[PDB]
């Protein structure tokens, strides 16, 4: 019998893991990456998934689909859907029974997709990278979802799994997968109160769990669906756009889709450098109109650019505690999930809020969800 895979089907990035040899192996894609963009693109001659899809986003905005997780199992007239639609370059139309229909151009014809068909292609890609890595067919999988996902959203995710040819053994909550990764369910007798602080690329989720006799109870959830790592990267982009203007007689790089994409990717990298170093250099040759660009950014400058965002990560933490009627002193574990939790200011605010309590951060924060999903998949296989 073949191994079962744990899949973190993320908003901006997807990650897959396999339990083997006393650990979880995070599956590398074609390029050797441990995470894959949740992107699908359609051209006159082909479809592209992940990296190849994200790499051409600048050239093909109308037919490059992303954020399908925000649409999955939702209805067209839903307030979150109409609001999200205003920031998507791709067309979203009303289908029969109020289902959102993604409309793109593919192979010279108009083609329509349901959000689960787009997530199915991301899952199909997660299956293919696993098959190449493990040298065999993979069908069994555990797929993760946010704890706030309703029945329709879970069912639509299960259907994306089926379309991809995966037998979805279980749909588990992302904070539960994270608790499993840290073995928080195996600490002993009595209640273990866990706070999962999940700051992803696109969404911010705080979940308060209670683990008793190995049973996971979601007591409360809160966050901001529109606060993520990309928002911090965007503040650097904005800084860099304005800095280029003053260095280059008011020239606006935002009018060139490629220049803006290039600069954004470099701001993502700089933000990552500023999580370990106190300064970063954004350097881009022939960025806009043959003009090279270079700027040095201190950690302090970056923190000042994202000041309002830092003030906002504690509000959901206070909310879950209030909603569950729990004192912060009762929290046994504070688990950090998502690359942006690497940000020193973010780590320092949480630790401070929990009166100096050290957080659970040992597991790669971009891989912790796939880690627990892989553990759960090995248990069910």
- Applying CB under 5 A, the residues found at the interface with Mg ion are 10-13, 200-201
Q: Which residues partner with 204 through β-bridges?
A: 199, 224
Task: State the Cα angle at 136 between 130 and 139, rounded to 5°.
Answer: 65
Q: Which is nearer to Mg ion, 74 or 192 (CB)?
A: 74
Phi/psi of residue 196, nearest 5 degrees: -100, 120
Cα-Cα-Cα-Cα dihedral of 227, 42, 93, 157, to 10°? -60
- What is the closest distance, in whole angstroms, from the C-beta atom of residue 202 to Mg ion in the complex? 5
* Torsion from C-alpha of 155, 161, 163, 167, nearest 10 degrees: -110
Q: Is 201 annotated as a binding residue?
A: yes
CA distances (Å), 203 to each of 54, 224, 231, 252, 343, in order?
19, 6, 10, 29, 16
Least distance in angstroms from the C-beta of 375 to Mg ion: 20
CA angle (42, 45, 47) in 5-degree steps: 35
Q: Is 268 annotated as a binding residue?
A: yes
- For residue 135, the surrounding DSSP H or E stretch is none
Q: Does the annotation list 13 as a binding residue?
A: yes
By beta-carbon proximity to Mg ion, the closer residue of 38 and 176 is 38
Measured from the CB atom, the residue of 185 and 205 that comes closer to Mg ion is 205
* Residue 271 counted as an annotated binding residue: yes
Lookup: tokens for 3: 């191994």
Report how far residue 226's alpha carbon sits from residue 345's, in angstroms, rounded to the nearest whole number. Answer: 20
User: What is the nearest approach in angstroms of Mg ion to the Cβ of residue 15?
Assistant: 9
372 known member of a binding site: no
Residue 73 vs 365, nearer CB to Mg ion: 365
Q: How far is the CB of 353 from Mg ion (least distance, A)?
A: 24
Q: How far is 78 from 70, CA to CA, in rounded Å?
A: 11
What phi and psi, each to the nearest 5 degrees, are found at residue 250? 80, 5
- Cβ at position 366, least distance to Mg ion in Å: 9
Residue 236 CA: distances (Å) to CA of 268, 304, 311: 9, 11, 18
- Residues identified as active-site: 8, 69, 174, 198
* Pair type for strands 36-37 and 13-20: antiparallel
CB of 347 to Mg ion, least distance (A): 19
Q: Smaller CB distance to Mg ion: residue 299 or 342?
A: 342
Q: How far apart are CA 287 and CA 256, in angstroms?
A: 9
119 is in an annotated binding site: no
Which structure tokens are listed for 85? 């639609």
> Does 73 show up as a binding residue in the annotation?
no
Q: Give 11 or 60: the residue with its C-beta nearer to Mg ion.
A: 11
Residue stretches of the annotated binding site for ADP: 12-13, 201, 268, 271, 275, 339
Residue stretches of the annotated binding site for Mg(2+): 12
Residue stretches of the annotated binding site: 12-13, 201, 268, 271, 275, 339
């Amino acid at each position: 019998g073949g191994p079962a895979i744990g899949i973190d089907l993320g908003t901006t990035y997807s990650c897959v893991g396999v339990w083997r040899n006393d650990t979880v192996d995070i599956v590398p894609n074609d390029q050797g990456n441990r995470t894959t963009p949740s992107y699908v693109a359609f051209t006159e001659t082909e479809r592209l998934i992940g990296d190849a899809a994200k790499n051409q986003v600048a050239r093909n905005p109308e037919n490059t689909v992303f954020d399908a997780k925000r649409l999955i199992g939702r209805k067209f007239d839903d307030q979150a859907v109409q609001s999200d639609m205003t920031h998507w370059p791709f067309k979203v139309v009303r289908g029969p029974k109020d289902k959102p229909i993604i409309s793109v151009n593919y192979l010279g014809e108009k083609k329509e997709f349901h959000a689960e068909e787009i997530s199915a292609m991301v899952l199909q890609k997660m299956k293919e990278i696993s098959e190449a890595y493990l040298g065999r067919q993979i069908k069994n999988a555990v797929v993760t979802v946010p704890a706030y996902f309703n029945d329709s959203q879970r069912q639509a995710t299960k259907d994306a799994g089926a379309i991809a040819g995966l037998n979805v053994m279980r749909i588990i909550n992302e904070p539960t997968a994270a608790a499993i990764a840290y073995g928080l369910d195996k600490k002993g007798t009595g209640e273990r109160n866990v706070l999962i602080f999940d700051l992803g690329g696109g969404t911010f989720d705080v979940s308060l769990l209670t683990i008793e006799d190995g049973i996971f109870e979601v007591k409360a959830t809160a966050g901001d669906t529109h606060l993520g790592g990309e928002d911090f990267d965007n503040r650097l982009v904005e800084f860099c756009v304005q800095d280029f203007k003053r260095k280059n007689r008011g020239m606006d790089l935002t009018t060139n889709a490629r220049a803006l994409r290039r600069l954004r990717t470099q701001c993502e990298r700089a933000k990552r450098t500023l999580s370990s170093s106190t300064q970063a250099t954004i350097e881009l040759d022939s960025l806009y109109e043959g003009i090279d660009y270079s700027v040095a950014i201190s950690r302090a400058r970056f923190e000042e650019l994202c000041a309002d965002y830092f003030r906002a990560t504690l509000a959901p933490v206070e909310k879950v505690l209030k909603d569950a009627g729990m004192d912060k002193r009762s929290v046994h574990d504070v688990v950090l999930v998502g690359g942006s939790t690497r940000i020193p200011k973010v780590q320092a605010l949480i630790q401070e809020f929990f009166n100096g309590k050290e957080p659970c951060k040992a597991i790669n924060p971009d891989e912790a969800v796939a880690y627990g999903a892989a553990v759960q998949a090995a248990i069910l296989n």
